[PDB]
Design a protein around this ligand. Structure first.
Ligand SMILES: Nc1ncnc2c1ncn2[C@@H]1O[C@H](COP(=O)(O)OP(=O)(O)OP(=O)(O)O)[C@@H](O)[C@H]1O
Lengths: 1081, 78, 145
């Protein structure tokens, strides 16, 4: 180092003036880099590269016995290790022809994987349309011929993490510089593979462990690791060029932002756990380590790492997950599936995998924590095995001997475990060996972290500034996005009308170089992208484009393209006839764009103004919204308004060159948006608002319970001579139900008449009539399915059905056709207006949870019918002495407003009965109440019975944990049998009191099963006796006076509840705790 | 829970004795007898010990009075 | 930081399963980045950007006495300061039209230096052939013309 190097003080001491360089610096232990690299090359060639089939380049999973199966993940890891060794050898000019061999080792493995995948193209086509385990790509192929080996009935073959890892590794090696993909057919295949990958967030997967779940009963559940790997692969493949340096504009892969956003939303909420049944697992390590680096949070990552280290760490290695029976002593090697209560026997004897020590060392090296790397190196050193030549071997796992299982269970970690079959000479673990080679290369500073991560998957805390779709320029802790807003008016007349009121707008005739397209044209253009007639490929499926996809600017066939959001188009529903709903939707879209924008450059937003919604009393809200837009801030979001030509100038454009490459003889025509010519008959020059009052009021005089058995001629005459719109619509509904839609009426066919009545009622703003028409037409909105899938993404279940009747649970995402069938074929016994109100409610709640998820904290499942019952009760209570008006005529604006008023966290004021009814209908529970239920369940034998349903104690404890979401679902299902919301709240209050008493008094225990109904009845009796003694009131039935009592206070409900609980508890045995020093008590 | 007014031990002892006498009469069909010769023989822990009657009586007295919720504890609706 | 951020142990102590994010982390001394950047902008405007000739954009070496000389290195360093301040301001979306002004200031200083150098092309030609102090580019130009 400095001062020591010079040592040139020939005479005493003095200042020296001469170059020192660095070659003359003292050198460490005398060993050239060539010797170390040759040693690594030897231990690689003799152990890892020795097992590779030249025909396909696929590494076999077994090194003995002539096994033909070969996994994909192991081959990918071996290729990664070979590529790392090639990068290590790259540092030497005279390589003696060794870098090329390892580089093509990686190349050949990747090409074999690609060939095996491309042998199944019909499987890709089927998975694109209906992704199911029966129609998924195989994960195990023959090691000699590249042929399928195991059928769907014995392996499942549903593994997406392998595909995601393959794509990410391909991106990494191509970015580092390689030649893997040759022609355009491979480009199309990879593009359609990415298309299949886009829809990971809905389909359950078997997971990396190929078991499916802890129970191992052939069940598929969503896994955090798979979602994270898919998100990382999508991030890497966005805008990436597969041809390397020698590439053009027609070799790029385009990724939809909506799928990435959905994956991120589905990941960032389930990440603290692994799945519904797995609280923690060791498979989360690759998701947040060197494979993926898909967690850009640095707090959730720390929490997950701490949880994993606290739970699954062992001295031999890391267990896969708690209660695992993989190759354990107690496992029975003749049955593929497990049994209920069997997994309890696998506690304390779980196997440990040493490869997670290598994973930890790699993560520590990447983060820059030498102490952790050294500690894990010392921990991993004694568990290594050497061959005859001395080459280290990493055992696959360690298993307890069958004789010592009892001793291990009594005191974990005391006994000595035995190495697996692949932990000595003769059998080897290629994945573990490649991991060890990579870890040793990285820990010895032979590989820089940048060399193995060209795409910069991992960034430090000081570099989370400018990454596409990962961080915004402001940073990861700030969001003040500014949205560019351009106003578009249809005709010059509308532009003049807006300009006369201080609003400046541009028309399509004034932006001639700029073409405005709807979403359909963009969808059609993206459909033509993935066309490959040689293999058979349909390209991108016909799906709508979200707000994120419509915020860019595209250049198609040399013409710039701008697309307005899907909010501005209306197809069949009457929700677009309210300007307030449009304003709410545009505000929600602006907030969603601001919250979930991570691209480069300000997003472009187009506003469409239609003459149909500036007419009448609705002109003022539109003018106010336009003034707010012009001011600069709308709904807490800052916006900028300027000319479109200036905005598009100097901005980043999107290139769609695949259209030119298409071999179609005739180029498809796209209809851009056009200026609307003015009428030559009426010549309406955008007149004033003119409120006026050409409306009347009358209630319908006919109900379905009366005009049912009346004859055809009389009902036809009544329809002819009547004028009420709602009464009319009722008569046409009856006519369609009985006489058929094709019946010929006085004014034409029935259906035409009902459509015309719906149209005029919507024009005249008669909500009852339009809702009746929509109910009788069985009309459907395409926005329900995205709302339902967003509901299911957030981990919240939805149930449709009338209050106090049959309901259906949507466990998993499903096609819109089945949703329509369920909604319109399960409410036949009730009025069809329930379906329409359910659609409105589900859309509103979906939008609210998309924008404000905090409003729904504490509730798991959403019941539309119970919320409607609470809606009606709230309308009644605001009615007071005067009866409530109606629920089906208050209009969607007031429906949403008073629904928001219902959704308030607290409603102090009116008596506790109303609050109890509202809370019970909304299905709101205290935080952690399910943990209290679990504690009671452990401390209460024989289970708990309520509302007829009985919940057992043995299988729940033996199969299931404290924090498992399965317990949440089971408790919700058990407690949902109660029909009265107030009774449900009484039950939950009793459960909370029981939990508090049990925790505060550990000595007491329940002798037998507890029946909550008996305790409720005893509380009734005690409260009635108290009231009769206090006021001399004769005993009365029904809960009508018990709910009104405040829960806490003087003679509250809680007091009677705890009195009954203690009376029951003291009836049983009292076991004294010897630990407590309280004597003679 | 707090005591509303002054406590008197004789009343609690009498109530515990009456509860024990009623329990014995129900269990073994034994007529009520004066003096606590049988009450003292009961062990102070286990099945229907004297501790159970004493804690039942004191809890019944406590729940008669007002219950003040502590805002420090995060337990809600309790 | 970690462990301190959660503070969600409502009942004694136990493992929690909920997102924590980083926005809820404790914040240092409360001061918006806009306020500090505005303070820096005022300091720059009142001291450095005040003395700049509109004709050429060359910063004068003297702030008083009506001196006409202007060095090149000082102007380059002033442009460096303006560019650095603009880069610092670039982190905000709503700059109120301030980043563009400093980006200009840098552009104008560079263009003034370039114009002053371009005014002497025969000097460059002579420097190419026989580099001598008598045939070298000038280093001090007029601040106004
Ligand atoms: N009316 C709408 N309002 C808002 N976003 C919409 C609307 N219609 C479609 N989208 C967006 O378009 C995409 C919807 O995709 P698509 O309709 O193909 O099905 P999905 O969301 O994958 O699920 P599902 O199986 O329920 O249809 C999502 O980005 C959704 O946000």
């Amino acid at each position: 180092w400095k001062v020591l190097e010079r040592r040139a003080r020939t005479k005493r001491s003095g200042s020296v003036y001469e170059p020192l360089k660095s070659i003359n610096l003292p050198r460490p232990d005398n060993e050239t880099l060539w010797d170390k690299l040759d040693h690594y090359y030897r231990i690689v060639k003799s152990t890892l590269l020795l097992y590779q089939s030249p025909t396909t380049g696929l590494f076999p999973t077994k090194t003995c016995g002539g096994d033909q199966k070969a996994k994909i993940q192991d081959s990918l890891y071996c290729a990664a290790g070979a590529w790392a060794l090639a990068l290590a050898y790259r540092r030497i000019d005279d390589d003696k022809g060794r870098t090329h061999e390892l580089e093509h080792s990686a190349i050949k493995c990747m090409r074999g994987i690609l060939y095996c995948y491309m042998r199944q193209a019909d499987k890709v086509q089927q998975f694109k349309q209906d992704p199911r385990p029966t129609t998924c790509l195989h994960s195990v192929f023959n090691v000699h011929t590249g042929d399928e080996l195991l059928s769907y009935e014995e392996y499942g073959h549903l593994q997406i993490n392998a595909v995601s890892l393959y794509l990410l590794y391909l991106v990494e090696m191509i970015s580092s510089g390689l030649q893997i993909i040759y022609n355009t057919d491979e480009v199309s295949f990879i593009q359609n593979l990415v298309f299949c990958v886009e829809r990971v967030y809905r389909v359950p997967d078997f997971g990396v462990w190929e078991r499916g779940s802890k129970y191992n009963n052939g069940s598929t559940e969503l896994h955090s690791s798979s979602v994270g790997l898919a998100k990382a692969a999508l991030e890497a493949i966005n805008g990436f060029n597969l041809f390397g340096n020698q590439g053009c504009s027609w070799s790029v892969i385009f990724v939809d932002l909506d799928a990435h956003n959905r994956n991120r939303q589905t990941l960032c909420s389930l990440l603290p756990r692994e799945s519904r049944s797995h609280n923690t697992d060791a498979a989360l390590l690759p998701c947040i380590s060197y494979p993926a680096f898909a967690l850009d949070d640095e707090v959730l990552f720390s929490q997950t790492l701490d949880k994993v280290v606290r739970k699954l760490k062992g001295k031999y290695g890391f267990k896969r997950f708690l209660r695992d029976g993989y190759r354990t002593s107690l496992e029975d090697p003749n049955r593929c599936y497990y049994k209920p209560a069997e997994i309890k026997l696998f506690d304390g004897i779980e196997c440990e995998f040493p490869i997670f020590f290598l994973y930890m060392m790699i993560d520590g090296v990447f983060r820059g924590n030498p102490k952790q790397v050294q500690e894990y190196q010392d921990l991993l050193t004694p568990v290594l095995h050497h061959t005859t030549e001395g080459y280290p071997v990493v055992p696959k796992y360690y298993y307890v001997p069958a004789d010592f299982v009892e001793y291990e269970k009594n005191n974990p970690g005391s006994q000595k475990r035995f190495p697996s079959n692949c932990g000595r000479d003769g059998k080897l673990f290629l994945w573990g060996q490649a991991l060890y080679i990579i870890a040793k290369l990285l820990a010895d500073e032979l590989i820089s972290p940048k060399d193995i991560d060209p795409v910069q998957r991992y960034v430090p805390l000081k570099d989370q500034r400018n990454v596409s779709m990962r961080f915004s320029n402001q940073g990861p802790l700030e969001n003040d996005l500014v949205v560019h807003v351009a106003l578009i008016a249809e005709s010059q007349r509308l532009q003049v009308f807006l300009n006369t009121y201080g609003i400046q707008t541009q028309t399509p005739q004034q932006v001639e170089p700029i073409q405005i397209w709807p979403q359909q044209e963009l969808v059609k253009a993206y459909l033509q992208l993935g066309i490959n007639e040689k293999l058979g490929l349909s390209g991108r499926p016909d799906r709508p484009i979200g707000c994120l996809g419509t915020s860019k600017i595209y250049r198609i066939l040399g013409k710039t393209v701008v697309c307005y959001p899907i909010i501005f188009d209306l197809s069949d529903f009457y929700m677009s006839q309210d300007v307030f709903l449009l304003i709410d939707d545009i505000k929600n879209a602006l907030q969603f764009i601001k919250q979930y924008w991570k691209m480069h450059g300000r997003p472009l937003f187009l506003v469409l103004i239609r003459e149909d919604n500036i007419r009448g009393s609705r002109f003022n809200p539109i003018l106010d919204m336009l003034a707010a837009l012009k001011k600069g801030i709308i709904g807490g979001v800052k916006v900028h308004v300027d000319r479109l030509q200036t905005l598009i100038s100097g901005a980043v454009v999107e290139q769609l060159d695949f259209l030119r490459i298409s071999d179609t003889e005739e180029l498809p025509e796209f209809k851009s948006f056009e200026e609307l010519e003015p009428p030559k008959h009426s010549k309406v020059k955008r007149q004033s608002s003119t409120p006026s009052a050409p409306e009347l009021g009358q209630q319908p005089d006919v109900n379905i319970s009366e005009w049912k058995d009346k004859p055809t001629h009389e009902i036809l005459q009544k329809l002819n001579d009547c004028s009420c719109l709602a009464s009319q619509a009722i008569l046409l509904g009856i006519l369609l139900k009985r006489e058929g839609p094709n019946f010929i009426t006085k004014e034409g066919t029935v259906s035409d008449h009902i459509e015309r009545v719906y149209r005029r009622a919507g024009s005249q703003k008669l909500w009852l009539a339009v809702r009746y028409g929509a109910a009788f037409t069985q009309k459907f909105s395409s926005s329900i399915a995205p709302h339902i899938t967003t509901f299911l993404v957030h981990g919240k279940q939805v149930t449709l059905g009338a209050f106090g009747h049959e309901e259906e649970v949507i466990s998993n995402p499903l096609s819109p056709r089945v949703i329509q069938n369920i909604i319109y074929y399960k409410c036949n016994t009730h009025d069809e207006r329930e379906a329409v109100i359910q659609q409105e409610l589900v859309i509103h709640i979906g939008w609210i949870i998309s924008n404000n998820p905090e409003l729904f904290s504490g509730m798991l499942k959403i019941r539309i019918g119970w919320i409607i019952h609470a809606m009606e009760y709230e309308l009644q209570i605001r009615g007071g002495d005067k009866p409530a008006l109606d629920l089906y005529q208050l209009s969607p604006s007031e429906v949403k407003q008073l629904l928001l008023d219902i959704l308030q966290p607290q409603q102090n004021g009116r008596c506790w009965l109303n609050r109890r009814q509202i809370d019970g209908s909304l299905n709101r529970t205290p935080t952690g109440f399910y943990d209290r239920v679990w504690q009671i369940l452990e401390r209460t034998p024989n289970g708990i019975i309520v509302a007829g349903k009985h919940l057992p104690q043995q299988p729940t404890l033996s199969d299931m944990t404290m924090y498992e979401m399965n317990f949440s679902l089971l408790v919700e299902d058990t407690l949902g049998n109660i029909d009265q919301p107030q009774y449900r709240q009484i039950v939950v209050e009793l459960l909370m009191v029981v939990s508090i008493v049990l925790e505060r008094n550990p000595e007491l225990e329940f002798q037998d099963k507890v029946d909550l109904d008996r305790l409720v009845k005893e509380a009734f009796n005690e409260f009635q006796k108290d009231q009769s003694r206090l006021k001399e009131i004769e005993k009365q039935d029904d809960m009508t006076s018990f709910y009104n009592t405040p829960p806490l206070g003087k003679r509250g409900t809680c007091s009677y509840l705890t009195k009954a609980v203690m009376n029951l508890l003291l009836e049983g045995e009292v076991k004294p705790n010897n630990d407590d020093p309280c004597l003679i008590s």
